[PDB]
Write a protein that binds this ligand. Structure first.
Ligand SMILES: [Cl-]
Ligand SMILES: [Cl-]
Ligand SMILES: [Cl-]
Ligand SMILES: [Cl-]
Ligand SMILES: [Co+2]
Ligand code: NA
Length: 129
């Protein structure tokens, strides 16, 4: 599923991301934009052989099982395919674990490079939520 901007913001708020670990909703929307272009089915192979899955491009090296990432972990206790669902619950729940892991949203390089410090509120502007 490719979400619209405001549709994703609303879904993210419903699932508890607004101000989660202090990160306003716009931060999460911005991260998803640059990670996946709001597409739940997005997958991208990483140089290390792991793969990123879903709207927040969660990586198989640590967070989910895809059966093809040697020496990796599955800290969210989910098949990586669960992260590709039109329902974002699994991605949100796993993202909550990631953002709690110590480095906050810097865990997403795209957030650090393209969202951090910018006017992230613009991502939820005009939305009914
Ligand atoms: Cl957009
Ligand atoms: Cl915001
Ligand atoms: Cl594996
Ligand atoms: Cl933080
Ligand atoms: Co990535
Ligand atoms: Na894994």
């Amino acid at each position: 599923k490719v979400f619209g901007r405001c549709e994703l913001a609303a879904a993210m708020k419903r699932h508890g991301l607004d101000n989660y670990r202090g990160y306003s909703l716009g931060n999460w929307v911005c991260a998803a934009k640059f990670e996946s272009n709001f597409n739940t089915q997005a997958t991208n192979r990483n140089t290390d052989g792991s793969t990123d899955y879903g709207i927040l491009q969660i990586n198989s090296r640590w967070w989910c099982n895809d059966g093809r990432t040697p020496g990796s972990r599955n800290l969210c206790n989910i098949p990586c395919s669960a992260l590709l669902s039109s329902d974002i619950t699994a991605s949100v729940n796993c993202a909550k674990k990631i953002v709690s892991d110590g480095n906050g949203m810097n865990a997403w390089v795209a957030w650090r490079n393209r969202c951090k410090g910018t006017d992230v509120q613009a991502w939820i502007r005009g939305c009914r939520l």
